[PDB]
Amino acid sequence: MQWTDQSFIEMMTPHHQDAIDMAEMALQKAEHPELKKLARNIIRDQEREIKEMKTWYQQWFKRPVPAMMGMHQGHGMMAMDLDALATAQNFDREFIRQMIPHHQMAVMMASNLKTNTERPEMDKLMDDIIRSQSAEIKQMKQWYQNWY
Numbered sequence: 001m002q003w004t005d006q007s008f009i010e011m012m013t014p015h016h017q018d019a020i021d022m023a024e025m026a027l028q029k030a031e032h033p034e035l036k037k038l039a040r041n042i043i044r045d046q047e048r049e050i051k052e053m054k055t056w057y058q059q060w061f062k063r064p065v066p067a068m069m070g071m072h073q074g075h076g077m078m079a080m081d082l083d084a085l086a087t088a089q090n091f092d093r094e095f096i097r098q099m100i101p102h103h104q105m106a107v108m109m110a111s112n113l114k115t116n117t118e119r120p121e122m123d124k125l126m127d128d129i130i131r132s133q134s135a136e137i138k139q140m141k142q143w144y145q146n147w148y
């Protein structure tokens with residue numbers, strides 16, 4: 001029903017990781033230059049966000065971020081598939097196919113936590129995640145239509 005600051009960070013940290021791995025693969029495997037630029041931005045932003053959340057987590061809860069089970073498909077965690085990306089005939093298509101719902105997931109988590117948090121740090125972070133990742137979705141949707 002409702003995320004807390006702690007639970008959000010615990011779930012979002014692993015989720016930001018799979019995205020980064022997808023984006024790192026794009027640096028070499030992407031076909032369109034538009035996509036490599038998006039990938040450099042995703043890496044930059046999401047790694048910066050991971051760091052802020054990890055710092056905040058230690059400050060507020062007096063422990064590092066807890067590492068349950070690993071992140072992968074089959075459990076409704078809405079995780080991604082790096083193997084399928086690497087083997088796809090059309091890299092950019094498969095990247096966009098997987099990244100859009102993954103981005104939408106983050107936007108929805110952010111919007112929800114934004115109604116539950118009292119912390120200005122999280123409010124600010126949620127704002128940026130929503131705004132930045134919604135524009136990235138909009139870019140990817142347009143590119144997908146043009147290319148395919």
Ligand SMILES: [Cu+2]
Pocket residue numbers: 014015016018019078079080102
């Ligand atoms: Cu994820």
Ligand SMILES: [Cu+2]
Pocket residue numbers: 072073074075
């Ligand atoms: Cu499993």
